[PDB]
Amino acid sequence: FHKIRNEDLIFNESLGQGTFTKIFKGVRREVGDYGQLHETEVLLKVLDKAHRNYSESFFEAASMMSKLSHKHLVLNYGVCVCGDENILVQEFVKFGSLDTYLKKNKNCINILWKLEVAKQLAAAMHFLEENTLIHGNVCAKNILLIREEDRKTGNPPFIKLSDPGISITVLPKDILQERIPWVPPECIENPKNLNLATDKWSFGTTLWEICSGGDKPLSALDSQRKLQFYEDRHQLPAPKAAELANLINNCMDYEPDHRPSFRAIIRDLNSL
Numbered sequence: 529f530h531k532i533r534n535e536d537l538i539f540n541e542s543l544g545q546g547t548f549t550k551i552f553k554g555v556r557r558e559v560g561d562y563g564q565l566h567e568t569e570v571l572l573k574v575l576d577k578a579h580r581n582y583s584e585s586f587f588e589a590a591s592m593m594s595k596l597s598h599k600h601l602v603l604n605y606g607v608c609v610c611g612d613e614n615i616l617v618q619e620f621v622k623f624g625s626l627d628t629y630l631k632k633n634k635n636c637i638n639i640l641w642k643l644e645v646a647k648q649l650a651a652a653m654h655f656l657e658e659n660t661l662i663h664g665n666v667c668a669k670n671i672l673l674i675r676e677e678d679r680k681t682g683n684p685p686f687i688k689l690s691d692p693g694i695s696i697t698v699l700p701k702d703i704l705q706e707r708i709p710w711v712p713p714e715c716i717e718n719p720k721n722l723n724l725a726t727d728k729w730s731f732g733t734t735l736w737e738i739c740s741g742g743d744k745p746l747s748a749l750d751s752q753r754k755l756q757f758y759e760d761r762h763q764l765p766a767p768k769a770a771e772l773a774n775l776i777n778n779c780m781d782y783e784p785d786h787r788p789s790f791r792a793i794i795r796d797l798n799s800l
């Protein structure tokens with residue numbers, strides 16, 4: 529990662545929190561192309577000082593994905609390691625995370641919008657699968673909306689997948705349980721079961737989010753009941769808009785080896 533000076537970063541408003549991180553909108557002063565000076569909006573992801581032990585996991589995962597440039601993968605500008613904070617300096621996506629976008633725009637979003645976003649997310653995941661890179665935290669919060677749909681120009685929405693974050697292979701067990709049903713059953717049984725098949729399960733959960741107006745599946749269940757949900761081998765309820773429910777359930781297969789390839793997922797999406 530390119531090293532960015534603290535003096536060249538301005539921290540502005542808080543945009544919430546991630547997993548052991550605090551999120552800020554900011555500005556980066558930089559020399560750009562042709563030597564032109566720019567002040568660039570950036571997303572600043574700040575690893576909590578009280579969790580400095582997780583620093584390696586978060587930045588290594590952001591790094592590994594940043595080694596694969598792709599139109600549906602978020603761009604990382606570099607890191608700021610000045611002072612006592614570890615900061616990922618990321619592109620600022622205008623419309624933020626999809627989980628909040630789905631809630632705020634539930635009435636406006638139709639099946640065509642959902643299918644397009646699903647197709648784009650599957651394209652990103654197919655790219656990762658072909659490169660044998662595990663994301664490990666596919667969820668609507670980690671889908672960033674670059675561009676809204678514009679029916680006036682027929683422009684579809686455009687999304688990117690955010691950085692993996694701290695690996696579930698090092699996260700505390702209680703955070704993993706709260707991340708049911710995005711974390712697949714085999715990773716609850718053993719977080720070292722993390723595998724490409726992990727992302728197929730979480731992709732199913734993410735489609736469920738996309739189809740559920742920003743609702744969080746199983747949010748009414750506490751961590752103990754989420755554990756028992758997997759023990760009893762339940763599936764998620766079909767979303768009211770059920771057009772993707774079969775695909776959701778096919779992806780959320782309790783047998784990891786039976787989960788379909790992203791190529792097959794894409795073929796299925798193209799058939800709707």
Ligand SMILES: Nc1nc(Nc2ccc(S(N)(=O)=O)cc2)nn1C(=O)Nc1ccc(OCC(=O)O)cc1
Pocket residue numbers: 543545546547549551571602618619620621622623624625628669670672690693
């Ligand atoms: N690159 C980027 N650009 C924006 N732009 C943005 C954000 C919010 C708004 S808001 N509030 O006014 O609606 C508007 C714009 N967000 N962003 C992200 O990476 N967010 C993000 C933050 C934390 C995450 O954590 C996941 C986890 O670690 O569990 C995941 C994702």
